[PDB]
């Protein structure tokens, strides 16, 4: 009904076309997650491709120092779930990698991979 995350990249990796995804702090706090190996739908220009979550990792977004921020907050026993919304929102991010497998067309014929 609504997009899961925000796409922030794309490319061709070998024979498969991939695209990175980012889950924002608000979405992560609402409880939305992606399971490795899941099947999702990608929209691009009126067409509906098929994707499979491949990887998932943590990477800083913007000018931030998550290691120092989290260490300093920990030594002071600050409950980030209740005390430091700004630090939580700055350090709460997560990246995913998705690959497009094809697209169902016409009466059900499945066109492998993609060129666009």
């Amino acid at each position: 009904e609504s997009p899961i995350g925000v796409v922030v990249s794309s490319r061709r990796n070998g024979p498969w076309a991939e695209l990175t995804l980012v889950l924002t702090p608000q979405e992560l706090d609402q409880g939305k997650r992606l399971l490795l190996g899941e099947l999702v739908r990608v929209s691009s220009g009126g067409k509906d491709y098929v994707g499979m979550v491949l990887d998932g990792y943590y990477e800083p977004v913007g000018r931030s120092d998550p290691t120092y921020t989290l260490a300093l907050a920990h030594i002071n026993q600050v409950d980030l779930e209740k005390e430091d919304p700004w630090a939580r929102k700055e350090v709460n991010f997560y990246h995913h990698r998705i690959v497009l497998l094809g697209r169902v067309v016409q009466g059900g014929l499945f066109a492998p991979s993609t060129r666009l």
Binding site: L72, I75, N76, E83, W86
Partner: protein
């Protein structure tokens, strides 16, 4: 390299003299009374105000071909906020005519929120342009700072008297700087004090760090004292700080804080000497209990981002910041509008001059 060149007649006595005033001030601070904060208290919402901006490319060295920028944004508890006031400063007009721009800005009052806020602030506080003196007309560098400070004050007053006229009384207003105006006549300061005095407005100014000697000695004091607490800065310490700041930057003369300084340690544990320490000022009509409540509210609204921060201050600053590509996009937009207004033949020369000007 040859570092022995500066090793001719080394002197080592001024250090001996210096290691007496710092010792005396440390002893004086040890005589103060500390008010701890027990992770609780009676707090009320905050409303921070800040002003940011930047400059166009080459504006610093060739202002006659560039422009300036200023934006003001505020954020408060409950997610409430006020509209953001922005303005573009033409370098050429201001350079060639100080005071030939502020009067026009005041007179327009057509669509610019900056002009609207300036008019509202002036009409509300009864402040006259003759009060500002000649500091802003001394040159462009002084005028820019004077304009930014006046616009900050005007945004505060305009918001108070336009948006929050009955619900404003329950908020602690935070200023990103010391409660002092420098380079203007004492009439401005007296009018500000009276307006904040008759209103009984809850206003507290946070200085962070720019405070040098004060933070130097307060970190040492915290090295011994423990916990989250507040303490009023000694008057002799404040006077010596003002004397040093004046002897360093005479232009800062008259920028004494309209109140007293308090120091509250927000973080129990830190990795560096001067983390989690808040320096704020209060208006003269605020007492020890008001200072205690302000410290409690600040501690409740603390953050661990920049080695301990008031939180709302950093959020407001981030909201109000100016993109570094905004000046370039604004320059391109200005060129486009100049073309669409004057013609096409008169834009080629401007573009060629810009290309030949780094």
């Amino acid at each position: 390299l040859g570092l022995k060149d500066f090793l001719d007649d080394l002197r080592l006595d001024h250090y001996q003299d210096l290691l007496r005033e710092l010792d005396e001030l440390y002893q004086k601070l040890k005589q103060e009374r500390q008010v701890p904060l027990h992770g609780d208290g009676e707090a009320y919402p905050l409303l921070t105000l800040t002003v940011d901006g930047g400059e166009g490319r080459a504006f610093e060295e060739l202002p006659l071909l560039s422009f300036g920028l200023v934006r003001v944004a505020a954020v408060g508890v409950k997610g409430f906020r006020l509209p953001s006031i922005a303005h573009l400063l033409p370098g050429y007009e201001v350079l060639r005519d100080p005071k030939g721009y502020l009067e026009g800005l005041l007179e327009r009052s057509e669509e610019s929120p900056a002009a609207d806020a300036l008019k509202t602030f002036f009409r509300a506080t009864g402040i006259s342009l003759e009060d500002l003196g000649e500091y802003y007309t001394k040159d462009l560098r002084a005028f820019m700072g004077i304009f930014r400070d006046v616009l900050e004050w005007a945004y505060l007053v305009w918001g108070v008297e336009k948006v929050l006229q009955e619900s404003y009384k329950d908020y602690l207003f935070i200023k990103d700087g010391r409660l002092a105006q420098l380079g203007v006549r004492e009439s401005f300061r007296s009018k500000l004090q009276n307006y904040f005095a008759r209103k009984h407005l809850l206003l507290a100014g946070v200085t962070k760090r720019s405070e040098g000697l004060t933070s130097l000695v307060m970190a040492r004091l915290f090295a011994e004292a423990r916990g989250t607490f507040v303490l009023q800065v000694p008057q002799e310490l404040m006077e010596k700080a003002y004397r040093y700041e004046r002897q360093w930057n005479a232009d800062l003369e008259g920028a004494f804080v309209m109140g007293r300084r308090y120091v509250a340690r927000l973080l129990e544990d830190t990795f560096r000497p001067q983390e989690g320490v808040a320096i704020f000022d209060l208006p003269p009509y605020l007492g020890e209990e008001d200072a205690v409540k302000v410290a409690r509210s600040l501690r409740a609204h603390r953050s661990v981002l920049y080695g301990g921060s008031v939180g709302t201050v950093v959020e407001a600053h981030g909201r109000a910041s100016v993109a570094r590509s905004i000046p370039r996009r604004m320059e391109e937009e200005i060129l486009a509008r100049f073309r669409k207004a004057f013609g096409e033949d008169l834009a080629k020369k401007l573009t060629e001059w810009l290309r030949l000007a780094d």
